[PDB]
């Protein structure tokens, strides 16, 4: 009868120590490896005036997506379960969830004072005008990144939150759903002792229900995303610009 | 007929 009070279980507490260190091998907060990317052209290179092609911001956000598919990887292959599964399966929760898990990780360098993405530099700091008749996805992004930037999410809560969306066992094309389903319990139910036990009142209330709506969102900006990447992909001067594996990947 | 995506995953 006193056994009815959650408890933070030994394996739920490594489940979190695993992904919270999983995410600080994957995600370098100083973003020293954004040097390397094809460089951003905001300004005219005649740079005090803006530059008018509307791609110009392509080879730098294409090597940027690159480069964060590649850290996806590396985090999912590290989620406990995750490589128990088939090499079939494994592929397929990546190249459903990795655009997903990219708009969760990057709110880290997403900040409400003026709605961008601030990577340590101006030169790394991307508004709505670089994304930039990309609208459709961008406003609905933004609302997304405010929402959950509200949420306050411990770290805990963040790393668990990214695990759970990889590991959807709803995702076309899965095989095993029985496997991937109990992979994803076990994270549900460590993100829900955790707040339950860890995350303080007022803002823990009905938080595993608003960040299970944020799953849900990102399956609408998913498809959203999916539509701008088919256009934009099709004409060969813009694919020209993109990386070998986002075309394997989000083609 | 992902090679690059398995590859990684290795
Ligand atoms: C990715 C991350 C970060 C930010 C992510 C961002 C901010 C910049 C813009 C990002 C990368 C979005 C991409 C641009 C989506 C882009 C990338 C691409 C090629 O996959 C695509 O189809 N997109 C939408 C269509 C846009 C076409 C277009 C591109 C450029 C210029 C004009 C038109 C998706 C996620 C966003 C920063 C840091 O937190 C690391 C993190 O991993």
Same mark, same amino acid.
């Given at each position: 009868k006193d056994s009815l009070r959650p408890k933070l279980s030994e394996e739920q507490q490594h489940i979190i120590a695993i992904l919270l260190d999983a995410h600080h091998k994957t995600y370098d907060p100083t973003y020293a490896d954004f040097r390397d990317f094809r460089p951003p052209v905001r300004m005219d290179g005649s740079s005090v005036t803006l530059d008018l092609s509307p791609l +110009?911001? #392509?080879?730098? #956000?294409?090597? #940027?997506?690159?480069? +964060?598919?590649?850290?996806?990887?590396?985090?999912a292959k590290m989620i406990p379960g995750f490589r128990d599964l088939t090499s079939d399966d494994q592929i397929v929760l990546l190249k459903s969830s990795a655009i997903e898990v990219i708009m969760l990780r990057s709110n880290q360098s997403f900040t409400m004072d003026d709605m961008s993405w601030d990577c340590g530099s101006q030169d790394y700091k991307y508004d709505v005008t670089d994304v930039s008749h990309t609208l459709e996805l961008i406003e609905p992004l933004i609302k997304f990144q405010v929402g959950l930037k509200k949420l306050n999410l411990h770290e805990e809560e963040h790393v668990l939150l990214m695990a759970i969306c990889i590991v959807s066992p709803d995702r076309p094309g899965v095989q095993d759903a029985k496997l991937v389903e109990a992979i994803q319990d076990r994270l549900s139910n460590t993100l829900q002792?955790?707040? %339950?036990? %860890?995350?303080?009142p007022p803002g823990s209330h009905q938080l595993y229900a608003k960040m299970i709506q944020k799953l849900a969102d990102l399956r609408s900006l998913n498809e959203e995303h999916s539509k701008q990447y088919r256009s934009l992909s099709f004409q060969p001067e813009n694919s020209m610009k993109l990386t070998p594996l986002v075309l394997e990947v989000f083609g | 007929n992902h090679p690059m995506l398995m590859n990684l995953l290795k």
């Open positions: +110009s911001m #392509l080879p730098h #956000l294409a090597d #940027l997506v690159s480069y +964060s598919i590649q850290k996806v990887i590396g985090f002792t955790y707040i %339950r036990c %860890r995350h303080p | -």
